[PDB]
Every structure is written in structure tokens, then in C-alpha cells.
Structure 1
């Protein structure tokens, strides 16, 4: 145990961001829950540590951190419990259920996908993150969470700024931020978000219209007691971050994973019915919310060498859990035909991702149209694919060619 602690003292936030897999491989073997001094927080790395802490509503509550409070606000849906959590879920869940979104797939999602597809067609090359996956993700999600009138460039800037803020976790032994300037993008985005949402909230609070934000304010509420801006805003920032970022990362991770398996990529491009399985494997293989899910202990609780205390962040590395050798065979490989087993990329239990049904449908349509249009698509050998992050993880660029 002493060897493990000595090694953990050497781990930096930079190493976690740039080379997480060997770190989590060792943690799964030696410390299922471990204190990371560089991040002033615990991290759970095995499947069972993540699942147990995620699910156990008696000993753990929804997570938060000083980054969540700075970037999102204090009382966000991730941290909420009891009636407050059920009220926030009542606000945000209904539009994300299949009964609600099913018509929008062909009426809205596919036309949006095809608009971005048409813009890259004929080039024989693209950088799929900025040119395709991110605009699709932010537009298809933004259009269903009240942000139809925010352009894709702004939505992408917002999610990147908020995600950078959450990732700004370097802290000294006393828990003080060593890079407070890394919050400047999130502060700027937060002010812009509030300036967009505040007038809409004020208008729709008094004159509801059936739109997404109107439902967030009024659904499940007495007439005359709608939710207020501050009751919703931290949770809306949760969604602006992850709702907008994660689907593009699912697409990118699945695309990248497929390229590592040439025969599987070929099979998928010619049989779109395999896309749901590919997309599920993409989430397992490079979980977009790799470790940014979290819980807080409600009482002192010990797992192994980790004695966690109230108020301390326990990050759940679902991405490591999804790479756990005790659960999956050769988890480091993308395998379209992997033996069936659930994954934790959407979490589990009462905080299970509200978007877990909608996101795989956006990603399916995005990849269907891409592979139909460009069956010869491939990575450009003149570029490398930079992958980054341990809290939120995904490819930063996907330079491709096609014939």
C-alpha cells in the first residue's frame, strides 16, 4: 500500500489528462478507490467501486467539487437528492424520453445531420470534430433544450469553456486552485448563457408556450409556482456542458475505434444495422464522461485504504470501470463483436444520464449519413489523432480523407 501511495504522489493532472490509461490500469489493480493529491480528490477506478458508490444513495450523495460550484453553480442536478433531484428530473427528463423525441429524429435530427454533411461533401477531407460531429451534437441537442437561437459556434464555445472549467482541477495540498485563470472561459460563457436564458425565462415564466424551457419552468409545478432561474440555471449548465459535448465525443470515439478494426469498419459502413452495437462499444472503449461523474460521502466510509469523509469529491472513473479487466476481455481494444455486457458510460442508479436514450439516436443518425455518403472514409495518415482528458475524454481532431 505504501508503494501505491508513493507513486500517487508523483501523478500530475497533466499526466492524467494526457496518458490516463496506464494510471487507471494500476489503480484498478492496487487501489480501487484512491486519493489523487494533484486533484485534491478521490477517484474510483474499478467497476465495482464505481457502481457501488454511484448506486449507494444511503452512504453517498450526488457529487460536486469547487470546479462544479464555480462553473455550474452550487445546487445542480448532479449533486441533488431527494425531492429536489426528483423535481429537477421532472423538469429535464420528459423531452428526452423516446415517446417525446421519436418524431424529431426524422423531422429534425436527420435534416440537421445532412446539412452539415452537405457542407463537407466534395472536399475529400475534413476535420470531423469541428466540421461534423460537434456542430451536429450541439445543434441536435441545443435545439431541444431551449437554445435553437444560439448558433453552433457559440454552443461549441460554451461547452468547451465549461468543460475546461470542470477539468481545471489542479489544487495544492490545502485544496487551493493553482490555475484560477483557467476559469476565465467558463466565467465568460456563464455570463453569455445567463444573458440568453434570463429573458427567455422571464418571458416564459409569465407566458408559457410549450417549448422546452417553458416545460422546465412549469412542468410538475403549481400554477403560480414555476421554477425560478436560480433553481434551474446550474442544471441547465450541466446540460449545456455534457448534453452538447458528449454526443459528439460518442460519435468521435466510435469512429476512431472502428478505424482501429478495418474489417469491422468496413462491415459497419455497409450494414448500418450494426451502428447501435458499434456506438455502445465506442462508449465503453472511450467513455466520454471518463471520470467527471462524482459522488460525495454522506458519512465517513472506508473502501480499502481510502477513508472518505463528507465534503470530499469522489470522482467515478466510469471510463476505467469500462476498461476493467475483471469485467471485459481485452478491454483496451475496440471490438464491435465484444461479448455482451452493460457499461457505465451513462452512469447507473438514480443519477443515470437523463439523455441516455436520446444521445445514441443522434449519434446513430450522424454516423449513418457519414458512412452512406463516404464509404471510403479513413483517417488522414498525414495527421495524428490527439486524444485528451481524464475527466471528459475524447478526440480533439479527426482529420479524414475519402474518395
Structure 2
């Protein structure tokens, strides 16, 4: 009763601006809990998240009214069975190491160095807009068919879609209380479709082996390519998270390192520590903090939570990765933390398709930054605003160097 009374007082604003004390209490008191402000359940412990994520018998891939509005109905996150296998066939192969490894030095590092040289000329930087986001959107956009879309547009798109997903304030009846918050996503969606539809039409009839051609034709009979609507919601999943998350991994890892000066110094002197740092960054401030989700396939009870079909169950992998039962002092960033899996890429059949590629983009981005500016530090003139409980990360990351 005490926990339910407290949850009735939690606002979306509190979740966005100060989630850690909320999830700390949930992990202790209610591993799965209904959040009235969001009209949805959230799972907060490692075991609640892992079990719900993996259990393909009692839960299906998640969705929500924001997913449907922003992405479309039949997106890969929500898909199961042959439909999910088919969408994974479309998106997965270009993201495997056998496919992307040559691009790391041919494409990714040159892209990173272009942005590195731009900030070198400034003598300081706001690393989100000036470095991490352009690198992320270019390196990912260039491998998902958006080679001809400029970085400003790609950043605008992911920010708009991510804002739409986060626009989850709902009343007791499940009605949006801020429908105007979808206007950026609605416009981004129209622009995305206007770019992709002519490419899909062309490549459907005359395949060329580019990324979108594979999305249409790989694993399909000749004469039965995927259609625009079969792909578009999933392409929007990738335009949101494929473009946003790598920049957040970089920023989370950078910020975490700044909290441990001796570890930051070690990493600047030895780039081979970056994979370990990046893994700890994902655990310490998981970019997809609670935007993963499942839906129940039957009425199912976990503790006081009796979940029913159609209801969103958000999986706070970011809270799971902060669970005191699994990690010692989980609120601390520790480059040398004892080896253990994390949930920042999820688990099971819906495990992130980008889980091998994203850490390589981030590794190269940080390698170049720390090699060029080993004296880099946070700019004390500007706070580092960290925001979000669905998607979480630094909004701005002003730095100085000597």
C-alpha cells in the first residue's frame, strides 16, 4: 500500500529529471510496478527485466501508443515469430562484424577525424552537437541507406522521434495529456517517408546491393520483396535508436570517466582500455534506460503486479544495470568493475541488432578524441544536463582542453 500511494505521486517530470531514487525504491519494493503517470508497468530489477525480456511464451515484443504514433504499428520491437525473423533478416546482416569490419578503417575513422579536426579548430567543444552526434548519425546513417541525408537532418529526426516516444504522460484512461508533443515526430516521419519512399520504389524493381536494397530483398523469394510499409516502422526504430544511442554511449562513457580521474588518465594513456570503459558506460548510464518493453500474452502476476494483454511493460534495463543485488556500488562508474553481463542491449530474441557495430563506432570516436586531447575536462562554465528515463543521456557536454 505504501508503495502504491507513493507511485501515485510520481510524475513523468520526476522520472525524466531524477530517475535514480525512484528506481532504487522500486528495486527494493516492487520489481514490477504500475506507474499511473505513464499508464504502464515498469520492471526495475535485473531478474524482473531479464525474465520478462527472455520469456517468449508469456510476453511478446513491446509497443505503446507512442510507438504506434511515432514509429508505426508493426515495428521490429513488437514483432514475433516468422514476422520478427523476417525483419531481423532484413536488418541484421550489415551489422555483423563480417560485413562492417572493413568499414571501420575505410569509413568510420575518416568520419570521426573530420569532426575531430573541426573541434580542434574551436579550441573547446560541445561534444554532443559538435562531435558525438554527427559521428553517430553519419557512421550509422551511412550504413542504413541514408548516405544522402545531411547530419543536421539526421540529428533533427532522431531527436524528434525520441521526443515522441518520451511523450508518455497519460491520464487514468490512457489518453495523452500532451498530444502537441508529437508535432516534431509527425513532421520527421513525413520527411523520412519522403526520402525513403522513392528509394524503396526504385530498389524494389531494380536492386543495386545498397543497404536499402538488402532490406527489401534479402531472405525473400524473387518477386516477393518487402514493401515500404513492411519496413518503415522498423526503419524508424533504427533512425531513432541507431542514430541516438551510439552518441549517448560515447557521452555516458566520457562522463563516467570524468567521475574517476585516475581511470580517465589511464584511458587517455592506453586506448586498449576503451572497450572495457565503453561496456561500463553502458551499464552505468544505459542509453535505452527504460524504452525497451514487452506486452503480456496472458494475464500474469509478478508480486503485486497483475499484468494483462495489451498493457505496456517497460523494461528499465538502466535500473537493472544499477541493481545492488547484481553489482557492488552500481551508482559508481568503475573501469575495473568485475566482469558481469549487462542488459543495455537487452537479451533473448530481441537482443539489439546493433550490439556488435555500436561499440566499434564508439571505440573509434573516443580513441581519436582522447589521443588528440589527453587534457580534456568538463567545462565548469556549463552544467552537464542528463535527462530521461525512457532514453537517457547527456543533452550537452561542454569540454575544455589545454
Normalising by structure 2, what TM-score? 1.00
Q: SS where residue 122 of structure 1 aligns?
A: helix
Q: CA deviation at 1:381?
A: 1.0
List 4+ stretches of structure 1 deviating above 4 A: none
Gaps of 5+ in 1: none
Query: 1:359-394: per-residue Cα shift (whole Å, max 9, x none)?
Result: 000000000000011010000111110000000000
Distance in 1 (alpha carbons) for counterparts of 2:55 and 2:293: 12
SS in 2 for 1:121: helix
Question: Residue 157 of structure 2 aligns to a residue in which SS?
Answer: helix
What whole-Å deviation, never above 9, does each CA across 1:123-170 have from its counterpart, x for those lacking one?
221000000000000000000000000000000000000000000000
> 1:45: Cα distance to partner?
0.1
What is the CA deviation profile of residues 233-257 of structure 1, one whole-angstrom value per residue up to 9, with x for unaligned ones? Answer: 0000000000000000000000000
CA distance in 2: counterparts of 1:384 and 1:189, whole angstroms = 29
Report Cα offsets for 1:170-220 as digits up to 9, x if no partner. Answer: 000000000000000000000000000000000000000000000000000
For structure 2, list consecutive stretches of 5 or more residues without a partner in the other structure: none
Distance 1:279 1:59 in 2: 33
Q: Secondary structure at the match of 1:400?
A: strand
Q: Which residue of 2 aligns with 1:126?
A: 125
Distance 1:246 1:123 in 2: 25
Q: TM-score, normalised by structure 1?
A: 1.00
Structure 2 match to 1:48: 47
The CA distance in 1 between the partners of 2:83 and 2:121, in whole Å, is 51
Rounded Cα–Cα distance in structure 1 between residues aligned with 2:380 and 2:207: 53
Give the distance between the partners of 1:144 and 1:124, measured in 2 at CA.
Answer: 31
Superposition RMSD on alpha carbons, in Å?
Answer: 0.3
Aligned residues: 402
Q: What are the superposed Cα offsets for residues 20-49 of structure 1, whole Å, 9 maximum, x if unpaired?
A: 000000000000000000000000000000
Cα distance in 1 between the residues matched to 2:79 and 2:341: 25
Q: CA deviation at 1:103?
A: 0.1
CA distance in 2, matches of 1:166, 1:379: 30
Q: Displacement of 1:122 after TM fit?
A: 3.3
